[PDB]
Amino acid sequence: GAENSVAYSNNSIAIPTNFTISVTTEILPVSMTKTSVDCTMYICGDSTECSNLLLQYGSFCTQLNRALTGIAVEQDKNTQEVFAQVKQIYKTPPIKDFGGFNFSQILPDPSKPSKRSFIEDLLFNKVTLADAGFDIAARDLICAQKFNGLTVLPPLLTDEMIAQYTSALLAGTITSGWTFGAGAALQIPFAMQMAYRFNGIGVTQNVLYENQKLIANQFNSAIGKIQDSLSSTASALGKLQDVVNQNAQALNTLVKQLSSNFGAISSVLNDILSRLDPPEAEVQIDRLITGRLQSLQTYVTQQLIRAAEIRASANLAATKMSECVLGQSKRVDFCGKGYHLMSFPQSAPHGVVFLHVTYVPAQEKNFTTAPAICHDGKAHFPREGVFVSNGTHWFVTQRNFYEPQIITTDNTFVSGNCDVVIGIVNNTVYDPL
Amino acid sequence: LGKLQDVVNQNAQALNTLVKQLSSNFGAISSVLNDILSRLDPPEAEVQIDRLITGRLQSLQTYVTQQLIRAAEIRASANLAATKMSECVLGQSKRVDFCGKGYHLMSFPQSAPHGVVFLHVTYVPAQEKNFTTAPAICHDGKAHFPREGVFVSNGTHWFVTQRNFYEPQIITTDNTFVSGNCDVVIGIVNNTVYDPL
Amino acid sequence: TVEKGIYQTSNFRVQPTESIVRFPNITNLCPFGEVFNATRFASVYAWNRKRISNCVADYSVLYNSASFSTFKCYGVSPTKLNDLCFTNVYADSFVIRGDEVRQIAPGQTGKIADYNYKLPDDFTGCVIAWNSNNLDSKVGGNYNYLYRLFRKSNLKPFERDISTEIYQAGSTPCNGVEGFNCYFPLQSYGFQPTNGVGYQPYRVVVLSFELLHAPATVCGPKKSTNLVKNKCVNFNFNGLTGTGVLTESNKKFLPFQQFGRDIADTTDAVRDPQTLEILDITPCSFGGVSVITPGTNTSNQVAVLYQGVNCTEVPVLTPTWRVYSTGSNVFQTRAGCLIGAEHVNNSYECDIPIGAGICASYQTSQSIIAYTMSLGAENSVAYSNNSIAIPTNFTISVTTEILPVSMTKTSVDCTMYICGDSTE
Amino acid sequence: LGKLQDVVNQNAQALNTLVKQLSSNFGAISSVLNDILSRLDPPEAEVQID
Amino acid sequence: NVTWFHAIKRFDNPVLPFNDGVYFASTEKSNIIRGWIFGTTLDSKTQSLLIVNNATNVVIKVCEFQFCNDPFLGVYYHKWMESEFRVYSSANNCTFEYVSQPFLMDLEGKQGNFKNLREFVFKNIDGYFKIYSKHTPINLVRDLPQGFSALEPLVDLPIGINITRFQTLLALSSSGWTAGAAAYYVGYLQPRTFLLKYNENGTITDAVDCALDPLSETKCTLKSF
């Protein structure tokens, strides 16, 4: 990175005189394709001799089927945990009077057949399948893997249902703040909610109310920038894509593993059965059974590890939904860079995008600062804020937004005398009475 | 208690399958090693014994691998439980939904076989009522904002209330602070702010 | 006793309705009499390789004749040859000393295997051998049968050497007449009727055909049947056997292209030998069978989900029961055919997942109903830019959260589990 | 720093085991490929190598 | 590297080794070098392949035929005249003979925009001799041009003999003799791995030689173009 020396000093402070509202996107995988592989069909489809031979190996692939079924169920559990955070389907009022904020780009679009937002449609377009439809299929899956006992199970919640959950969460957030997450939704004007949020990061709410137009414009421009970025760049959703890709190739590998001899005369089981008598056919069939069972076990182990990873990701996504969308988080960098204000969820194929809104101080000015003020042999400390000076006069300012004020007995509190505090400076503390 | 029962059942099932795997020929003449030894001499018994050894070793490998994966998920669960004990029992959490639904008050631990049970005590607002509200109050060309709470009216009079439990109070210079004039705040309403002095 | 839920069970698949055979339209029998009544079999070093193709070969009669002392098929079984089809056949005939009949088999070595005649390691075919002492042996010694004993380097498999160059193991290269360290490569056999078993001559013929790598030309006398498409059947095209559904395709097969393979090395298309037409191959429908049931004590009726198949097929199997095909309540969900459940417009919270947003519940008379699950109760928050809802009261809630912490500590003894008190 | 050391150790141990596993016959005549190749013809060297 | 042979007194028609197949794209008229010989003796000792591929048809003739030191018709056509007859010296014995369709290449007299790139791949292996072929309408008469085109099989023969050498047959005294303006190309085939792009119709549109350069090896490893 770039070298940077901070102008540190034992009586110097930098205080931001401005701010920016930054909206940043965070993509999290939530689920993955529910693939089921049939033991007997894969190792050897519709072959009774091989089926009997495989029956000698015990209960290996009843275990394999159980593992795959567990993964498939866990995918639905992940989606439910992440998105079914809200028990009521809230909807926004027809009038979008939110103080100048307007969420049309993230609110549902009635015109489109799927009640997805504009940004949700962009997200669904950016992610592209790899092998074949898993979906928009009006018929059989129509995939190569399908030929050999491999099937894909549809997710329990349709994409439209995920979009409905996302819309309910977003409507609750923008019409009720964080109240709907702790009980019944309590309406509040959005500007007042933003005042709450500003007060939550240490800036007084008069800062919001006196900059409402600017703050609304900044938020709208940030949303516009997000949509423009999604439209333009291609590798934005790589994470989600990666998941898909990995699964795809794994399946492909498994399927390709049916072309291996494993030391037999031929990889095709029908050829072995046609060309060779049962006694000698058993040796070749056993070689094939060993190879294919090993391949399937490798596949299932890889899938279990990947499912554990995806479940960790889904737990993180659910925590983010609870703490960044359903409330305001004081955890640093948990809901984006800056001071978290609010987050909005969007649904993406097999995952969730979070639009984290953050307050970022913008234009810092240098001031001389002191830890306390001496008035009449008494040491005054700011109640909430910091002492600054332009160079000749001393003021009290909130520490996150330069707003100088006359140092008065209401601004500060007294404790002790001048003789103990290091760096104390004499100045007059004005008494309003 | 489905989760603890599920882990117990999974472990029992894995052990049962591992034991059952000892009944399989794996291509040998029989699944009983002693029978193979007694029925055949060493040179031919070795092939059958190798078949059984390969099968049993594969069974052990599968059991140990699934045990490792289950141990990983159980370790994740135990880390979550330890974090919950630290943040919900040893303190108060502002993290939403981390220690139950609602505003977290406290939590109590209880021991369960192979697990922990947290009784999360939370505060949930119960009976909401409507009020007309304003971001600020204009008194003498000065905008008054509540120090902590919100301005609410019941139709004729304005009060300031803590913004989590209805408890109206007179707007005074001790309840509010001044910032600028009334020409810039959107939604400001004229009302009187009562000075106690 | 089964708890409420949906449980997987043995898959389903459509079995073939009939079988199909499509072989080339040829009747001429292969010249097996020529190679088995060759007046004089060539020498081992001059082993003669006759071709056999564009004919019909009936190996049953050859296998049934008892005149053959040895009849061993390596990569194929002799009984099955009557139902296989091949590209071309090499019938290699010769005469050898009986003892060498073991050097003939693949993977062997010796002067015969290193100077005159060598087989491949991966040989697929059939070796036939019969004693011809009375036919080709004389008291004075039928020295018409020679073998190559000297050669500079070992010959490659299926290689024939005829040059009479005088090899010289101990250097000193001569030519023509023999001499020091150098001798005539070919040595004549002492084939006489007085000779004992092994030394007496043996007439040997080996069939070393290739398999399924080119348009098949010669194969068995089994009559091709008629071609039926759009149906799950068993097909056998030029010996390539399988099961599935046939259908026309718009492929472009080269004049010498017969099969269309798949990424998994499976044939997804074929060319009918009798009619030069391309015919698509697709495995007929299969899938998993799930059973939806409330608590067995709650009731004993169930529904069945055939997942991954449009229900129209099911009336058109493996699960061993076809009773429910009566239908009248078949429901085609995006997750498969659901049988035994009533579709309803009403939406309720999910009870038993089916997939694609469909859930099944057992409700009032009593019956299992399939419905689109309801996400929750609709609610329009009374939002306005000057209205606020403030709670005038509160509730103290106590909820439970259960977390697994540990699992049973298990240990295994390698030798005990694998080798129970067995030293071997 | 045991937590760190453990990690290192584990990896090393695993690698060691892997390398040591090259000294096992697995039922073959010997654990050295070169010996099998130099002692046997392809037909049986194939079985041992398998 | 592809050897370039000047077809003519100056008979640049030697016996060339048949190491693992050959590639035979050439540019000329009248077919000059119509026939080919493939054997290990090529002097009637063994049944040396004699393919003709004349204007009529490819008369495959695997017979123990005698090839003189200079087996050429010696026709100084358009200098149509004949000098002697040694293209077919004598057929001492034979092994097999096949006759294909009476086709006709574009050997007929035509230069124009030279469209006689009759690119052939003669490969002998595992007792088989294959004649993959294609015709490309190129525009340049100079050395082989730039472009891509997949070669279709043309004949497939199960000959079964062993061949270790080949040769080309020229149908075309020494005082003031005009050297023939004809030449052909001999390229050798060796074992390599190719990544072939089967387009929607089943035709190879492009290929990657997996050992040409590091980039091609990367494409081959990734299975992408």
Ligand SMILES: *[C@@H]1O[C@H](CO)[C@@H](O[C@@H]2O[C@H](CO)[C@@H](O[C@@H]3O[C@H](CO)[C@@H](O)[C@H](O)[C@@H]3O)[C@H](O)[C@H]2NC(C)=O)[C@H](O)[C@H]1NC(C)=O
């Ligand atoms: C709250 O503040 C006052 C409450 O009295 C209102 O706004 C102000 O209302 C006065 C009238 O009482 C306006 O003064 C008038 O101005 C016109 C034009 O100059 C003049 O002809 C009249 O004789 C009278 O003086 C005044 O302009 C108006 N605005 C301000 C900034 O004083 C109103 O109820 C509320 N306004 C705001 C900004 O909250």
Ligand SMILES: *[C@@H]1O[C@H](CO)[C@@H](O[C@@H]2O[C@H](CO)[C@@H](O[C@H]3O[C@H](CO)[C@@H](O)[C@H](O)[C@@H]3O)[C@H](O)[C@H]2NC(C)=O)[C@H](O)[C@H]1NC(C)=O
């Ligand atoms: C806030 O909600 C409280 C509920 O947790 C509520 O306490 C409840 O008050 C009612 C009304 O006095 C009590 O009901 C008693 O009286 C009615 C009317 O006679 C009877 O029908 C009932 O059977 C009962 O005898 C509840 O018992 C009482 N609940 C508890 C736990 O004590 C508060 O009154 C509410 N506060 C406000 C300001 O509304």
Ligand SMILES: *[C@@H]1O[C@H](CO[C@@H]2O[C@@H](C)[C@@H](O)[C@@H](O)[C@@H]2O)[C@@H](O[C@@H]2O[C@H](CO)[C@@H](O)[C@H](O)[C@H]2NC(C)=O)[C@H](O)[C@H]1NC(C)=O
């Ligand atoms: C504020 O810092 C300056 C140091 O100069 C810059 O300070 C930062 C704002 C940033 O711009 C850094 O890259 C610089 O180091 C302190 O001293 C000033 O120094 C400049 C020259 O470096 C001089 O021209 C000014 O007159 C100095 N005084 C100022 C700017 O007030 C300064 O003391 C710091 N402010 C206070 C109130 O202490």
Ligand SMILES: *[C@@H]1O[C@H](CO)[C@@H](O[C@@H]2O[C@H](CO)[C@@H](O)[C@H](O)[C@H]2NC(C)=O)[C@H](O)[C@H]1NC(C)=O
């Ligand atoms: C809400 O924001 C959106 C985008 O910032 C505005 O939508 C635009 O509306 C104009 C007409 O008013 C159209 O010409 C544009 O094509 C729209 N673009 C997009 C991206 O939406 C919308 O006007 C805003 N609504 C309000 C009330 O300001």
Ligand SMILES: *[C@@H]1O[C@H](CO)[C@@H](O[C@@H]2O[C@H](CO)[C@@H](O)[C@H](O)[C@H]2NC(C)=O)[C@H](O)[C@H]1NC(C)=O
């Ligand atoms: C520091 O702040 C004080 C007060 O804000 C400044 O003093 C004021 O300066 C303006 C013009 O510059 C005058 O109109 C005011 O009357 C002044 N107020 C007082 C109380 O004197 C002071 O100039 C600032 N210092 C610097 C260096 O900018």
Ligand SMILES: *[C@@H]1O[C@H](CO)[C@@H](O[C@@H]2O[C@H](CO)[C@@H](O)[C@H](O)[C@H]2NC(C)=O)[C@H](O)[C@H]1NC(C)=O
């Ligand atoms: C802050 O740091 C400066 C040094 O950068 C200190 O400067 C001293 O100031 C006093 C008088 O104010 C002088 O007598 C000293 O000689 C100065 N020191 C140096 C090294 O020049 C200053 O005192 C410090 N202030 C506090 C409160 O720590």
Ligand SMILES: *[C@@H]1O[C@H](CO)[C@@H](O[C@@H]2O[C@H](CO)[C@@H](O)[C@H](O)[C@H]2NC(C)=O)[C@H](O)[C@H]1NC(C)=O
């Ligand atoms: C802050 O004010 C105090 C008191 O007004 C100053 O302390 C005085 O310092 C002078 C000069 O050293 C002495 O003569 C007085 O006796 C001191 N009085 C007391 C009560 O301490 C102090 O010096 C001032 N600080 C600065 C930085 O000037």
Ligand SMILES: *[C@@H]1O[C@H](CO)[C@@H](O)[C@H](O)[C@H]1NC(C)=O
């Ligand atoms: C099969 O019959 C058709 C017409 O009856 C014929 O054209 C074809 O040649 C026959 N098959 C073969 C291999 O000749």
Ligand SMILES: *[C@@H]1O[C@H](CO)[C@@H](O)[C@H](O)[C@H]1NC(C)=O
């Ligand atoms: C040899 O010929 C006889 C009669 O000509 C025949 O019966 C016999 O089967 C032939 N041998 C074969 C076909 O192997």
Ligand SMILES: *[C@@H]1O[C@H](CO)[C@@H](O)[C@H](O)[C@H]1NC(C)=O
């Ligand atoms: C199921 O119903 C039976 C009544 O036949 C009852 O005895 C049993 O306890 C019930 N089980 C459950 C789990 O509800």
Ligand SMILES: *[C@@H]1O[C@H](CO)[C@@H](O)[C@H](O)[C@H]1NC(C)=O
């Ligand atoms: C749903 O209602 C429509 C009429 O709007 C009716 O035709 C249909 O039968 C109903 N659904 C079912 C499953 O009967």
